[PDB]
């Protein structure tokens, strides 16, 4: 229906290579690949990739998850079922393991600009939240300085997914359902309207929740929205958002990626990515990783997308896409939109 993104492979392991990819991290020019052997490769993205540095025995076991906080110049790694903080550039350990992170399931990182209530000065605040059984551990950086106190919230069930709704609220997903946690006040709220609980952040403080084939739309406060359920045939393995589209990753056996409209819920695009098992997000594209290939998703310019929709006769979809987009991303959103509306009538 639409060529929203173009898929090109930037990293390829060979079929009989003993190493497999477990997670990646892309920041600027660089892509950091964590392997099942504990090694950590660093790639430079050219304009496909050049292997700059391999750190074997970075962690004595597989690297499950990677993140960074740029203010503190810190690399967060989930390995040996614990969490470790390394220097982003020398990769020497700052704190490995991080205290109380033993048997951690995962973590979620955010960093936002917040104003001091007393002085009203913009300050960069960083949040790292780790899931350890039914416990939620919260570290924070104030001006890249890690605070000496760790906040802990105890839940009623084990945490299976963690997605930051905003700078102060975190959506946590368990088996029974989803909850909203206020990291500042430690207050938990129930969300009202083996399958993994999926959650991704949309635009304008909106979030999409998915369990099996059921879906729900909420806001940054965690209140339900009057929206239809997304009509996809099978439950997605993962979900994500790349402005302005919703992305759904089907199980690795199918090896497909769905690009859907958050407004009309129609299937804009389907991409065949064999073995694709995870999505990686930060108007620039995202990444999709298999156990051997890392593809970079390049978004087509939105003017050509709307022209393609108009040429196909999908007028209502072009109107919805145009309404969603910011005006600076189009040559002339106003006149293009009025034109498409006059083509409809």
Numbering used by the authors: 1 to 47, 96 to 241, 271 to 359, 369 to 431
Provide excerpts from the study.
To address this, we first analyzed the N-terminal β-propellers of Vps41 and Vps39, the likely binding sites with Ypt7. Cristal structure of C. thermophilum Vps39 (1–500) construct (cyan) is shown and superimposed on the model of Saccharomyces cerevisiae Vps39 (dark green) generated by AlphaFold.
The heterohexameric HOPS complex mediates fusion of late endosomes, autophagosomes, and AP-3 vesicles with mammalian lysosomes or vacuoles in yeast, and is probably the best-studied tethering complex. Five out of six HOPS subunits (Vps11, Vps16, Vps18, Vps39, and Vps41) are predicted to share a similar architecture, comprising an N-terminal β-propeller and a C-terminal α-solenoid domain.
